[PDB]
Ligand binder design. Structure first.
Ligand SMILES: *[C@@H]1O[C@H](CO)[C@@H](O[C@@H]2O[C@H](CO)[C@@H](O)[C@H](O)[C@H]2NC(C)=O)[C@H](O)[C@H]1NC(C)=O
Ligand SMILES: *[C@@H]1O[C@H](CO[C@@H]2O[C@@H](C)[C@@H](O)[C@@H](O)[C@@H]2O)[C@@H](O)[C@H](O)[C@H]1NC(C)=O
Ligand code: CL
Ligand code: ZN
Length: 607
């Protein structure tokens, strides 16, 4: 470690911690920057040499973390948590968690290489027919979104899960062991316990389970209504009205958002078409327009525009030179208070416009907290970070807003149009909830050893069936590693944040809508141009992780806890409608034929 980056001496006291945190921040930006930069260079241009550079950068970060971590423990391990300065306690608490820097050098290098190889496998996996091969984004994504051929959907689903998941399994086992070895040295029973600790709630798992109990009936009704729609297209051979839905038929590789099958389920087809994708295409929208439109919503609230560095540095389309890249959308803070970027293989669709807002929400958070101490440059919890852009996107997707931006000519305000809109939003928001909940239940079980390698797939599918009510369309066994075919697993990005965000965003939306002076139905609120809503949101953003999330939330929405009631209020009309429709249609709610799997197509896979 460069002498300039090494820790000096400080008194074994609070006033010493302060000068310590200051000296840390002075070097930590440089170390954070070099790491993020090396990661960027790799993720926008996956080469062996870029992976090598990224591993060396990670090693340097671990040296830094070890040196500053050991020093924090040297001076404070017996005494440290009684500091009067709460922000200083949070800074120190973070510095002293070494994580993978607890590993001896050889195991650090093993750990860093496993992360690089898992990233490479996921982001370069292909499905091959011909000598021609399909990438996940855009090719397989487009098949899942727009093919209605059971056999073709099956080819893409099986192809992807086999190509990504199978080779990842042995690496993921090794990663899990090393990760646990690392975090056990910080005092945590396993890595999952460390991830859950970010929510600073002793009742976190119970609180989540109680939220889900309130949400589950909404999902069960949406599921039954959708299953019926699919039965009408695919027939009795491929859809069991009392069994799980085949996992490839819901518009999305993970069945996690069902927005792409909106045309099959839309209750009132003769009302305005709320999927504006075809209008974006007809109008000639490109990625640049989508980002500028998202930016203008932020500036309408008197939040910050995207800086020149963002426009100059970002990767907003998949490179056309055919470079391998990580296409999964992400937002980047380089920790130098200047560089902030999005890396997105943007496609011209309505859902992608939502994703642009999601990512830009991350960037806005970064811009607003850039001057806090580097340890406090995080969301009040990770769920807050995931919610910011989604909240704006709730206003953007309203038929009233879409009209304002030239994407929906017809204006209607009637009960059928409301049901259509709420059903569309339910396909995006309600359909996700079981998935958002289950992914880290799976991973917490892996980290804890409740799910050893011999049960990775068995337990994955148990949870997928339990929560989502889906089944794999071909037989799976433990050679398969279907959890690994979801970005966040090989890229070691925690998932519970998304479940938390999907609840939180409605709490935020309700609060901002009230602040805006809006007095109509919550689902028709548009906060566009509300500088009062902007100011309330800015308060959250500027806090970073400097204060307890429960207090930040209380200041914002008037309650110190996650609460499903705003989500339930938002969806109330369609919740009631779906329940009525399912009863009238004689549906079974749930999937009591839990063993059921669809047959294979007759000529599969030939053709
Ligand atoms: C992608 O990464 C590679 C390195 O892994 C870059 O290749 C280097 O490019 C620089 C500047 O053009 C050269 O001077 C080196 O000789 C190159 N090294 C190798 C190993 O080829 C490549 O330029 C990067 N491409 C993009 C588009 O950023
Ligand atoms: C796991 O499954 C692998 C391939 O799937 C199998 O063959 C396809 C065509 C289907 O018939 C499917 O039902 C079968 O499971 C096998 O190559 C592999 O042997 C299986 N793993 C173990 C340990 O048996
Ligand atoms: Cl999280
Ligand atoms: Zn995000």
């Amino acid at each position: 470690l460069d002498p300039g980056l090494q820790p000096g001496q400080f008194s074994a006291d609070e006033a010493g911690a302060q000068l310590f945190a200051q000296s840390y921040q002075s070097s930590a930006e440089q170390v954070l920057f070099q790491s993020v930069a090396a990661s960027w260079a790799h993720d926008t241009n996956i080469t062996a040499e870029n992976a090598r550079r990224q591993e060396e950068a990670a090693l340097l970060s671990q040296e830094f973390a070890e040196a500053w971590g050991q020093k924090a423990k040297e001076l404070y391990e017996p005494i440290w948590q009684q500091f009067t300065d709460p922000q200083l306690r949070r800074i120190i608490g973070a510095v002293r968690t070494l994580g993978s820097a607890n590993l001896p050098l050889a195991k650090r290098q093993q750990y860093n290489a496993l992360l690089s190889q898992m990233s490479r496998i996921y982001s370069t996996a292909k499905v091959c027919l011909t000598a021609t091969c399909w990438s996940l984004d855009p090719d397989l994504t487009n098949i899942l979104a727009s093919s209605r051929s059971y056999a073709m959907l099956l080819f893409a689903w099986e192809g992807w899960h086999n190509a990504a998941g199978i080779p990842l399994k042995p690496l993921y086992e090794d990663f899990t062991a090393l990760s646990n070895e690392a975090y056990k040295q910080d005092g945590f029973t396993d890595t999952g316990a460390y991830w859950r600790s970010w929510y600073n709630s002793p009742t976190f798992e119970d609180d989540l389970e109680h939220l889900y109990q309130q949400l589950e009936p909404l999902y069960l009704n949406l599921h039954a209504f959708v299953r019926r729609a699919l039965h009408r297209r695919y027939g009795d051979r491929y859809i069991n009205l009392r069994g799980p839905i085949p996992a490839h038929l819901l518009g999305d590789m993970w069945a996690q958002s069902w927005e792409n099958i909106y045309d099959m389920v839309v209750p009132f087809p003769d009302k305005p078409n709320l999927d504006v994708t075809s209008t974006m295409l007809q109008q000639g929208w490109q990625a640049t327009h989508m980002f500028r439109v998202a930016e203008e919503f932020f500036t309408s609230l008197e939040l910050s525009p995207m800086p020149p560095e963002f426009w100059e540095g970002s990767m907003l389309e998949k490179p056309a030179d055919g470079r391998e890249v990580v296409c999964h959308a992400s937002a980047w803070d380089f920790y130098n208070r200047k560089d902030f970027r999005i890396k997105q293989c943007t496609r011209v669709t309505m859902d992608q416009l939502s994703t642009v807002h999601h990512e830009m929400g991350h960037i806005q958070y970064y811009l607003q907290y850039k001057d806090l101490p580097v340890s406090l440059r995080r969301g009040a919890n990770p769920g807050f970070h995931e919610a910011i852009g989604d909240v704006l996107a709730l206003s953007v997707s309203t038929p009233e807003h879409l009209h304002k931006i030239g994407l929906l000519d017809r204006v209607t305000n009637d009960t059928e149009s409301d049901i259509n809109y709420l059903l569309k939003m339910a396909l995006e928001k309600i359909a996700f909830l079981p998935f958002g909940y289950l992914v880290d239940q799976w991973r917490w079980g892996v980290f804890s050893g409740r799910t050893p390698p011999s049960r990775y797939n068995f337990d994955w599918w148990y949870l997928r069936t339990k929560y989502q009510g889906i089944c794999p369309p071909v037989t799976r066994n433990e050679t398969h590693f279907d959890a690994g075919a979801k970005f966040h697993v090989p890229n070691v990005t925690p998932y519970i944040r998304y479940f938390v965000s999907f609840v939180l965003q409605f709490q935020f939306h309700e609060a901002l809508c009230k602040e805006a002076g809006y007095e109509g139905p919550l689902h028709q609120c548009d906060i566009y141009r509300s500088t009062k809503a902007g100011a309330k949101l800015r308060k959250v953003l500027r806090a970073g992780s400097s204060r307890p999330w429960q207090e930040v939330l209380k200041d914002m929405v008037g309650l110190d806890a996650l609460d499903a009631q705003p989500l339930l209020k938002y969806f109330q009309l369609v919740t009631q409608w779906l329940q009525e429709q399912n009863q009238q249609n004689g549906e079974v709610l749930g999937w009591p034929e839990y063993q059921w799997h669809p047959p294979l197509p007759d000529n599969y896979p030939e053709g």
